[PDB]
Amino acid sequence: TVRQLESMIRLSEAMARMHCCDEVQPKHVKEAFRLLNKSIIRVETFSEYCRISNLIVLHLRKVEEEELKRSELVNWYLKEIESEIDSEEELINKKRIIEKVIHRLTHYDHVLI
Amino acid sequence: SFSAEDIAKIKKFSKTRSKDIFDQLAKSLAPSIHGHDYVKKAILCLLLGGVERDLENGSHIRGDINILLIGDPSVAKSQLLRYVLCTAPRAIPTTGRGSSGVGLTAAVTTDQETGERRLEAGAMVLADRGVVCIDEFDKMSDMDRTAIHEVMEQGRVTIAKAGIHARLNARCSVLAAANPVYGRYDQYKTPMENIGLQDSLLSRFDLLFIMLDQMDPEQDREISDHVLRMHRYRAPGEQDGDAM
Amino acid sequence: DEDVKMITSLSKDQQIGEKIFASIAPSIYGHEDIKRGLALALFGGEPKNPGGKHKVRGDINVLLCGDPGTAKSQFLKYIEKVSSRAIFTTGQGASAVGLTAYVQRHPVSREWTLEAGALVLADRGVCLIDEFDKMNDQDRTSIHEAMEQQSISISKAGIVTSLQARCTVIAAANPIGGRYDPSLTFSENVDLTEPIISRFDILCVVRDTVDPVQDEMLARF
Amino acid sequence: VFGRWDETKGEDNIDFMPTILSRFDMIFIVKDEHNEERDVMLAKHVITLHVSALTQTQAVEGEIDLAKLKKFIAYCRVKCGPRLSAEAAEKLKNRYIIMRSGARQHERDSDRRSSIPITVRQLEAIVRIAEALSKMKLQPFATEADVEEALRLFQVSTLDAALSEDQEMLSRIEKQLKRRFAIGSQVSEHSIIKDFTKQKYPEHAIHKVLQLMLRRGEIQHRMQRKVLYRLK
DNA sequence: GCATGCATGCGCATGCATGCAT
DNA sequence: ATGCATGCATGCGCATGCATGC
Numbered sequence: 001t002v003r004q005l006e007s008m009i010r011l012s013e014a015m016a017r018m019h020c021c022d023e024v025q026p027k028h029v030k031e032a033f034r035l036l037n038k039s040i041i042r043v044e045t046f047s048e049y050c051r052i053s054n055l056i057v058l059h060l061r062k063v064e065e066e067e068l069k070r071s072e073l074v075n076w077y078l079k080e081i082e083s084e085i086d087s088e089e090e091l092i093n094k095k096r097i098i099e100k101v102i103h104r105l106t107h108y109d110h111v112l113i
Numbered sequence: 114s115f116s117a118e119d120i121a122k123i124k125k126f127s128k129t130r131s132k133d134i135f136d137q138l139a140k141s142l143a144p145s146i147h148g149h150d151y152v153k154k155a156i157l158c159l160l161l162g163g164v165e166r167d168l169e170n171g172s173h174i175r176g177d178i179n180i181l182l183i184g185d186p187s188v189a190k191s192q193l194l195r196y197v198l199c200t201a202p203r204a205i206p207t208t209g210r211g212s213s214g215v216g217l218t219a220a221v222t223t224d225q226e227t228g229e230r231r232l233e234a235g236a237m238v239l240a241d242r243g244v245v246c247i248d249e250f251d252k253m254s255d256m257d258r259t260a261i262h263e264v265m266e267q268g269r270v271t272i273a274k275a276g277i278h279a280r281l282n283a284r285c286s287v288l289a290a291a292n293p294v295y296g297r298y299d300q301y302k303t304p305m306e307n308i309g310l311q312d313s314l315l316s317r318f319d320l321l322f323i324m325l326d327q328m329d330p331e332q333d334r335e336i337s338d339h340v341l342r343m344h345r346y347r348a349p350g351e352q353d354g355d356a357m
Numbered sequence: 358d359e360d361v362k363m364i365t366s367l368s369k370d371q372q373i374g375e376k377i378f379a380s381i382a383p384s385i386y387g388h389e390d391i392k393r394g395l396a397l398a399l400f401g402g403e404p405k406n407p408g409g410k411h412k413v414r415g416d417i418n419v420l421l422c423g424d425p426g427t428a429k430s431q432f433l434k435y436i437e438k439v440s441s442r443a444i445f446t447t448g449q450g451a452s453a454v455g456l457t458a459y460v461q462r463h464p465v466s467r468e469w470t471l472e473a474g475a476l477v478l479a480d481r482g483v484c485l486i487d488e489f490d491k492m493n494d495q496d497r498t499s500i501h502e503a504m505e506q507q508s509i510s511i512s513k514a515g516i517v518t519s520l521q522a523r524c525t526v527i528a529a530a531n532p533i534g535g536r537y538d539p540s541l542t543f544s545e546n547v548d549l550t551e552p553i554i555s556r557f558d559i560l561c562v563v564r565d566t567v568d569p570v571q572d573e574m575l576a577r578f
Numbered sequence: 579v580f581g582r583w584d585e586t587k588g589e590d591n592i593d594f595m596p597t598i599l600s601r602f603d604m605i606f607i608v609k610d611e612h613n614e615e616r617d618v619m620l621a622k623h624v625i626t627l628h629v630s631a632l633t634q635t636q637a638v639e640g641e642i643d644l645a646k647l648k649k650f651i652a653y654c655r656v657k658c659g660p661r662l663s664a665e666a667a668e669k670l671k672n673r674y675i676i677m678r679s680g681a682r683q684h685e686r687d688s689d690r691r692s693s694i695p696i697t698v699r700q701l702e703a704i705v706r707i708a709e710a711l712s713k714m715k716l717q718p719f720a721t722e723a724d725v726e727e728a729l730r731l732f733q734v735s736t737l738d739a740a741l742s743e744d745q746e747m748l749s750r751i752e753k754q755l756k757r758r759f760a761i762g763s764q765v766s767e768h769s770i771i772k773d774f775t776k777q778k779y780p781e782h783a784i785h786k787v788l789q790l791m792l793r794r795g796e797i798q799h800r801m802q803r804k805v806l807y808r809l810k
Numbered sequence: 811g812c813a814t815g816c817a818t819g820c821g822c823a824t825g826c827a828t829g830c831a832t
Numbered sequence: 833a834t835g836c837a838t839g840c841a842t843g844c845g846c847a848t849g850c851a852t853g854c
């Protein structure tokens with residue numbers, strides 16, 4: 001939040017006081033920014049599943065709002081990926097993965113009906 | 114809160130009726146309440162009471178009786194409790210959450226004036242050789258029941274706080290009124306589920322009565338007749354339409 | 358005397374309302390709707406009472422609910438500064454002015470006094486409440502009776518009194534989970550009860566969506 | 579309990595136990611009866627009241643002033659108090675017996691314990707209402723008309739609250755719709771309307787059931803408002 | 811299973827009133 | 833004759849025990 005901005009300003013002032021300089025220069029701001037970033041720790045649980053789910057939700061909601069079935073969705077996703085997959089083995093593996101993910105989303109997560 | 118020549122009346126009535134004395138006394142207990150002959154007989158037995166016995170070894174045998182009434186709403190239990198309160202000489206009403214264990218049982222307070230510790234009597238201590246009526250008995254907490262257990266067993270209260278210890282007499286009798294856990298008495302379920310009380314508490318009670326509001330047309334007709342006859346009544350010597 | 362003429366001349370301006378709306382909270386960036394609602398609350402309305410049977414109040418109570426870091430307290434501080442009779446209090450505790458009336462010997466003057474709540478002291482004024490969801494049972498009951506009946510009844514230490522509490526209430530609050538969820542209703546996102554929410558005329562919802570341009574402008578300010 | 583009344587659910591909308599409910603003499607239930615023509619009347623009435631509050635404060639048609647009404651009520655309460663008569667007592671006896679028998683029959687047929695029982699307390703409440711009606715006229719004895727009015731009021735309030743054919747018919751429609759619908763299937767509103775009109779049920783009941791299901795969240799709109807689908 | 815709300819004893823100092831020993 | 837120690841509330845600060853609510 002903005003409290004982080006105030007903390008950054010305070011840390012820059014503290015660093016300037018430490019170095020006895022009369023003005024705040026970008027080095028102190030960079031140090032404060034680095035320290036604040038190192039303070040934050042990411043949560044460990046998966047990202048690929050979230051990205052695929054978000055893409056599916058975005059596509060389905062765009063289709064619904066602008067104006068398909070499960071097979072149509074899978075075909076559209078494969079068509080979009082076409083430029084990214086070079087071999088048939090990877091294509092079929094990704095197809096199985098997305099089919100399982102869609103089944104989980106429809107049945108387990110209840111996100112899609 | 115006695116006459117002189119009513120002794121002759123008492124002697125004549127006794128020597129005449131003999132066996133019918135108990136039946137007539139039970140029947141005329143409360144005209145305002147219709148039915149419930151066994152409950153009236155039990156209340157009369159409470160009014161009369163048993164005999165306390167003391168033996169050579171100092172053992173004590175209780176002589177008081179305890180009765181618990183359970184039933185559907187609007188079966189005139191609170192009315193009976195109020196009538197007992199009015200008629201009994203030393204009658205004390207104590208509802209479920211109205212008084213706690215410290216109020217029912219005497220306590221110790223340190224006097225600031227002299228620095229000593231004194232005893233303040235509780236509700237049951239005051240009602241020696243009397244009657245204590247407890248409406249909404251089911252709402253009472255477990256600890257209060259445990260405290261009441263000693264009085265119901267031997268009619269004595271033991272108190273001890275460092276520097277003072279005493280035993281007070283609590284030879285009293287208890288009326289209790291409670292509602293079923295389900296609000297209305299379920300006919301199909303066993304009485305154990307409906308009452309929902311531990312075996313020790315029921316055992317320490319002497320009599321258990323179950324009252325039901327059976328919607329029989331003849332009983333309803335008789336009850337309505339009695340209720341409206343009582344409601345239409347006006348005291349003699351009072352002008353009709355007078356306020357109060 | 359000349360002030361009245363100046364006010365009348367200002368009222369003749371075609372954009373007086375926009376000027377008044379923009380004047381509130383100069384140090385707070387954005388939130389035009391909040392400022393407009395606060396202006397409407399400050400100007401107020403007119404109570405009505407046909408005979409002595411049906412009373413209708415004219416005060417406009419305002420409730421703001423928002424995520425942390427949205428400067429909810431600054432609006433309350435500015436309103437306290439502007440208002441001639443404004444009483445500020447917090448539901449967290451250790452407030453300078455209490456929210457419940459009581460009779461006590463004052464620690465300073467050592468005299469037997471009856472101190473009323475902030476609602477009574479704010480009669481014909483403004484009452485600002487911060488941390489509206491941290492209140493206890495007594496404060497909630499007092500606020501409910503002051504908002505419904507517009508009066509406070511006291512029965513303590515042999516004293517039985519009824520006091521008027523005609524005031525306008527402005528409150529600030531945060532969501533239950535620390536972040537507003539659009540998928541749920543406003544009632545489900547606040548610890549308050551429906552009858553309390555129903556009293557407020559204006560409800561404002563503040564969110565912290567990441568807009569790079571707005572964030573850059575706020576940082577510059 | 580749920581914040582707004584659910585007509586089809588009937589009971590379980592009251593959290594109070596039957597014990598505390600037996601003490602109350604009368605229980606009234608108010609619902610938001612949504613009529614297009616009614617809302618306009620309410621809005622116009624409110625606006626007219628707001629406008630006329632500033633100018634005039636006068637009785638509409640012979641209405642008593644607040645102070646006069648207060649003094650009159652106090653005088654009536656202080657002065658006299660009436661009691662019932664024999665014929666009214668017999669009529670009330672017959673009506674109470676019939677009502678209790680009907681309540682027992684309804685409880686047996688519905689196979690569910692009513693949350694609003696009928697006991698001697700209700701009879702005493704009716705007696706009290708009749709006595710109040712007689713007291714209102716300063717008469718020393720009540721008449722049959724007062725008893726009839728008290729019985730009408732007690733019926734309209736208590737029997738309507740407790741018995742809460744329209745609602746049973748709505749329950750029938752709800753059961754039929756639950757049996758016909760399936761999870762994940764789509765149904766057109768016209769199909770439902772045609773199916774239930776061929777069964778000769780009123781359209782308003784169907785619309786009310788659909789609105790209640792929408793409130794609960796079982797029914798959702800797929801394509802605009804023409805086709806519905808079932809959720810849980 | 812524990813922290814907290816609500817009495818209650820403990821120890822103390824402080825203020826207001828009065829009653830008379832040096 | 834006069835100034836002071838004491839009896840009687842009352843605030844202050846504290847610890848301790850009983851009940852309950854999550």
Ligand SMILES: Nc1ncnc2c1ncn2[C@@H]1O[C@H](COP(=O)(O)OP(=O)(O)OP(=O)(O)O)[C@@H](O)[C@H]1O
Pocket residue numbers: 002003384385386387424425426427428429430431531575578
């Ligand atoms: N629009 C804004 N313009 C200027 N400063 C802002 C703005 N929004 C937030 N701030 C700053 O954010 C800081 C956060 O403190 P502030 O008291 O305003 O927070 P708050 O919204 O009341 O938070 P809390 O939810 O913790 O009570 C303040 O120093 C304030 O100046």
Ligand SMILES: Nc1ncnc2c1ncn2[C@@H]1O[C@H](COP(=O)(O)OP(=O)(O)O)[C@@H](O)[C@H]1O
Pocket residue numbers: 145146147148185186187188189190191192336339340698699
């Ligand atoms: N058998 C009966 N005869 C006469 N009156 C009755 C009878 N049963 C109930 N009533 C009336 O109904 C009321 C019941 O109230 P109450 O005694 O408080 O019920 P409960 O004690 O079961 O809660 C009483 O005022 C009483 O006048």
Ligand SMILES: [Mg+2]
Pocket residue numbers: 187190191192
């Ligand atoms: Mg009773």
Ligand SMILES: [Mg+2]
Pocket residue numbers: 429430487
């Ligand atoms: Mg704040």
